[PDB]
Amino acid sequence: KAKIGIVTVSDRASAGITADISGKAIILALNLYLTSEWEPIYQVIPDEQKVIETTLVKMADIQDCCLIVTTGGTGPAKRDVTPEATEAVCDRMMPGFGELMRAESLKEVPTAILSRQTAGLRGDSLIVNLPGDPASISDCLLAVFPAIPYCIDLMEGPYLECNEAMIKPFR
């Protein structure tokens, strides 16, 4: 039974004012893609840097889910601290995730260079950032997910089985 963490970062959704929506899209894309048994671990937290550090650490080590996904807090507003919380909790940085997603939301929206997304590894767990817009969540998830099952396999994580119709993994 593989496990995946989905984390929504927004004071609006954490206080219950608005529906998360952005995280719902991540779960929907993951109900696609994946043909294998998988369980989602999912919390909605505010733009508190230490609170983000905890939910990531708790999911990466105690829950031990192989892949963690964040959404929001990646822009240039002083509120946004989602990337900074990822750099503290990870031993190593995967710079190719942010560079690719920044260019593949860019040929559609030019105000995507204003992103601070990044990704890293907490030992055996892979954490990746996504923005708040769901329409660019599918565009960003689609762009990096082919390498993720191979990456999780490289860290001896659970084998991710992919759907040939919805996505295309490389190994």
Binding site: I21, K24, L32, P134, S138
Partner: protein, 123 residues
Amino acid sequence: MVRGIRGAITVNSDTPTSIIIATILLLEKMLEANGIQSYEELAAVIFTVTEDLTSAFPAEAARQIGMHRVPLLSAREVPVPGSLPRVIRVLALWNTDTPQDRVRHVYLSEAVRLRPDLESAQL
């Protein structure tokens, strides 16, 4: 006694996933905004993609949320030059006595530009 519910949403690429996710997101938001408890209240639901969205059906997404009960139908909204591209639009027909000014319309993503202005021209 029926009311219409307009919906709209955009995608950032023409892939089967992005079409299905955007469709379900818009569909489930349209029902939640109006308090739709069950699909039995809907008479039928209708979708419009543009000319540039083709890789998948809005029905295939609607069937993965249990709307086999619901009659579905889709086509291509007019390919107008300079119009908002890659937009999926929804007209769900709702057996209800709700007043017309009460029905929540749901324009999401970059498709909020299509949100009807309350005072636009009005010749």
